[PDB]
């Protein structure tokens with residue numbers, strides 16, 4: 001342990017942006033990540049497990065693998081008992097909500113679908129009226145786009161390849177309902193994907209990999225921002241180090257208690273690490289838990305009442321349509337979405353939907369969708385001193401507005417095509433809409449609420465939040481581009497106004 005000028009907690013999008021710009025500014029920075037650096041070939045020779053061969057690497061400290069949501073009827077047959085291990089995907093279970101997050105150097109960038117989408121400007125202006133939207137769209141969205149290595153599918157290759165038949169089927173069905181589709185930019189390299197389909201490079205997206213990591217193709221943050229941060233010479237990353245408490249001492253700045261564990265979860269050491277500037281990039285769940293705990297255990301007692309508040313799941317809802325026999329979606333489905341349905345107009349009926357692949361590897365006739373909706377309901381994280389956890393108080397009825405909007409859109413598609421929903425994909429009770437999961441947790445430490453308009457935590461100096469906990473519950477699109485661009489904005493201002501090299 002010891003002192004380092006800047007500490008960044010976590011290594012997801014907010015953290016990675018912050019560490020790069022700190023290091024470029026000459027500020028010696030230590031990143032603390034609770035998960036692994038994913039660079040050691042495993043027993044199959046690969047870093048990551050695929051969706052048809054899950055093992056302990058798939059899961060953060062669970063004793064059994066799980067099928068990706070939507071796929072249980074086909075993928076339960078590959079599930080196995082596993083040792084609890086520091087694997088890459090954590091399903092965090094709350095009372096009535098399961099939030100999925102990445103664990104490792106790169107955070108959710110390791111496990112996500114790569115979809116890189118800028119929000120609608122008029123919606124950005126609605127959710128964050130205190131922010132100057134011209135500087136976001138003129139400067140920080142472009143900077144994020146370039147640094148993340150966003151790229152665009154070859155639309156002619158898209159049209160021709162078997163691997164996107166599933167997307168084409170939903171496009172034609174939507175089209176009968178008078179709905180067009182949009183191509184979705186991605187950080188998975190689409191040139192690599194063409195080499196995969198040609199047999200020239202190892203398959204990853206085209207071998208049912210994404211949610212437990214991609215062994216190839218996906219430009220996760222370890223390849224982009226974090227590689228650049230290490231390249232500054234001013235940034236180091238310590239792994240299997242979980243920050244537990246944050247306090248003030250006579251040294252000035254902040255002092256952390258940090259548990260070092262092995263990959264089996266055994267406690268090896270508790271370290272004291274301290275800093276002048278402290279940046280929280282532990283995600284919506286992790287940053288909020290740290291600050292709720294610090295407030296309610298009295299280590300940072302002047303934190304305000306908005307710490308913990310304002311959480312939402314980005315309106316996330318999953319649903320599925322049963323195609324007729326003559327409209328198969330194909331046995332070969334790229335694991336990386338390329339198409340969406342943009343029915344988002346900022347009204348309460350708004351939906352932005354991903355046309356999601358089914359990883360079964362054989363024909364199912366299912367079209368799967370992940371809808372993003374506009375639902376004003378919010379939850380709060382409440383400290384439980386008995387277990388030393390933040391607990392999210394969300395109830396399943398709070399997703400009714402999200403379900404309603406999703407269903408109105410997909411009812412229009414079903415009606416135009418003579419199809420019905422599947423009701424059997426999400427457990428044994430009949431349920432067409434999965435309404436108790438989240439891939440896109442947003443809020444808990446909302447920008448301008450718990451913090452100033454640049455993520456400076458209210459009540460404290462040189463204490464910053466950088467990540468999805470800043471966003472007010474919803475962005476109307478897949479969120480990592482927004483998180484990245486906001487982080488670019490915030491750290492540039494913080495370095496200029498607050499920091500010394």
Ligand SMILES: Cc1cc2nc3c(=O)[nH]c(=O)nc-3n(C[C@H](O)[C@H](O)[C@H](O)COP(=O)(O)OP(=O)(O)OC[C@H]3O[C@@H](n4cnc5c(N)ncnc54)[C@H](O)[C@@H]3O)c2cc1C
Pocket residue numbers: 009010011012013014015032033034035100101102103104105106107108109111112113114115116117211241242243244281282283284286287290439440441467468469477478479480481483
């Ligand atoms: C299955 C899935 C699919 C998704 N698909 C998309 C997509 O296609 N496009 C999109 O835009 N978004 C997608 N997302 C969401 C996106 O990945 C997240 O919005 C984004 O990763 C959030 O970034 P963040 O910086 O807030 O936190 P995270 O990326 O979650 O990173 C937080 C990091 O902090 C670490 N950490 C947490 N607590 C501590 C602690 N106390 N001490 C040390 N380290 C800690 C974590 O282990 C993690 O590495 C998806 C996510 C999932 C799970």
